[PDB]
Amino acid sequence: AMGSRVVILFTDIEESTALNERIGDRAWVKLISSHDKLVSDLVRRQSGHVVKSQGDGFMVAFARPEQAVRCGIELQRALRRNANEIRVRIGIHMGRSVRRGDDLFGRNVAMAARVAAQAAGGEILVSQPVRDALSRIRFDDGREVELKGFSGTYRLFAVL
Amino acid sequence: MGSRVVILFTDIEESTALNERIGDRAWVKLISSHDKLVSDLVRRQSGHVVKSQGDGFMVAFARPEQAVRCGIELQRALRRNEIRVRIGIHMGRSVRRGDDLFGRNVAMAARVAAQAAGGEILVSQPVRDALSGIRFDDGREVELKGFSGTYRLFAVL
Ligand SMILES: [Ca+2]
Ligand SMILES: [Ca+2]
Secondary structure, three states: OOOEEEEEEEEEEOOHHHHHHHHHHHHHHHHHHHHHHHHHHHHHHOOOEEEEEEOOEEEEEEOOHHHHHHHHHHHHHHHHHHHOOOOEEEEEEEEEEEEEOOEEEOHHHHHHHHHHHHOOOOOEEEEHHHHHHOOOOOEOOOEEEOOOOOOOOEEEEEEO | OOEEEEEEEEEEOOHHHHHHHHHHHHHHHHHHHHHHHHHHHHHHOOOEEEEEEOOEEEEEEOOHHHHHHHHHHHHHHHHHOOOOEEEEEEEEEEEEEOOEEEOHHHHHHHHHHHHOOOOOEEEEHHHHHHOOOOOEOOOEEEEOOOOOOEEEEEEEO
16 A cells, blocks of 8 residues: 555644734744644653644644643643733545655545644644544544545544 | 735635546646746746645745736646636735745735636736836626625636
C-alpha cells in the first residue's frame, strides 16, 4: 500500500486576522510565538511532531490516535487557563499518507484539514476512523457533514 | 512592523478534487514536479520560498517587478503543459524571523491570492502603484476576511 499510517492533527486560531489587526504586529508576533511554543511543547509531550506551520495554523503528526486526542485536550485546557482571547479549532484524522520532504501528501492530509475546518473555536473534531479506533476518551454521537473536495457524507465526532 | 518585502502566494485551484480524481500516487508525482517548477522560477527572479505546504507556496521578493515577472512566467509555464493556480502579490512591512514571515501583510497577501481566479495574477494596490512592461486592468473592489472596509485588487494583463 502507498504511504504510511499517520494520525494528522490540524489546528488554527479562530478569526486570527481580525485579532492581528486589533492588537497590531508587535503584539501579534509575541502572541503567535508564545502559541507556537505552547503547541510545540504539548505535541512533544505526546511524542508527536509539528510537520508544518504557517501563520495561525499547524499540521501535526502522531503515531497513535490517542496521542493526538490527548494533545488536543491539553491544548484546549491550556488555552482556557491562559484566557483567565485565543480560541483554536482542532481536527484529527488518520490514514495512509505519503511523506515527501518534511511534508505529508495525499487525500488523507486534505481530509484532516477539512475535519479541522469544520470544528468551532474551542472544539476538537475527529473523523469516524479515529472515533472507531478509540471506541474502547469520550465522544458525542457525531454530526453528518460534507467536506470540500470530497464526495459523500462524513460523520465527525466532538471530543468530550 | 518589520522590513519592506514583496509577498507572493500561489496555490492550486481545487487540488483536493484533483487528488481524489487521479489518486495519491499520481498526485504526489504531480505536486513534486510542480514544486520543482515553482522553485526553479522563483530563483530565476531572485525570490526565496519561505514556506510551502501541500499545494501552496509563500514566496518573498525584494522588488514588486520580480514577483510579478515570476507570476507571469509561472502561468506561462503551466500553460505550456491540467492545473490552474491562483497567484496573489502584496507588499508592505513584515517581520522576518526564523526563516518565516509574520504580520498582517502576510495575511493580506494570502487574502489577495485567495481572490485570484485560477490562471490569474492579482496584486494589491500598493503593488500596482509601485509598478507605474507590466500592464494591469482597472481593478476590482472586494472585502477581505479579517480586514475592515474594501480593497482594490488588480489583475496582470
Ligand atoms: Ca484561522
Ligand atoms: Ca488550493
